[PDB]
RNA sequence: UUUAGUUGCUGGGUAUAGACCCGAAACCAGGCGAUCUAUCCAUGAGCAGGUUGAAGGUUGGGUAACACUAACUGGAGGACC
């Protein structure tokens, strides 16, 4: 699991301003980190359906935020997906 | 109570022997055969040419990741002509 230091590092790397925590870039970066971290857990425990539900919710939330960011500003969307290595 | 036998030689008959001659399918004893053939053991040899394309492998699409999927390789078989 990620800790406070890792989350603070992600927030500092992707913030758009001082004390910025709610921007779509920060939110998508945090969700991507959490999903990538949970991949390892779901490798070991194949039948944790109850936790896989929360994982699916995280994926859906990230997709919605990415769509909103693409609608608002295309350049920021491309920059963010390039930075995090997301295919779309 | 019957009062001529016996020993030779020749002949007829019978008995034991193969017993007038030829003829079985068999049964028993001891030896000879696996240079044919049946199975096995050891050591060698042989199978023109042409098809089909199993497992496995690599790469590419696809997903939150699995899944799924295409192409190329690969050369299996009491496999095919």
Curated annotation (Swiss-Prot):
GO terms for cellular component: cytosolic small ribosomal subunit. The keyword rRNA-binding applies. One of its GO terms (biological process) is translation. SMART domains: Ribosomal_S15 (SM01387). The keyword Nucleus does not apply. GO terms for molecular function: rRNA binding; structural constituent of ribosome. Keywords: Ribonucleoprotein, Ribosomal protein, RNA-binding, rRNA-binding. Belongs to the universal ribosomal protein uS15 family. Part of the 30S ribosomal subunit. Forms a bridge to the 50S subunit in the 70S ribosome, contacting the 23S rRNA. NCBIfam families: S15_bact (TIGR00952). One of the primary rRNA binding proteins, it binds directly to 16S rRNA where it helps nucleate assembly of the platform of the 30S subunit by binding and bridging several RNA helices of the 16S rRNA. Forms an intersubunit bridge (bridge B4) with the 23S rRNA of the 50S subunit in the ribosome. This is Small ribosomal subunit protein uS15. It comes from Acinetobacter baumannii (strain AB0057). The gene is rpsO.
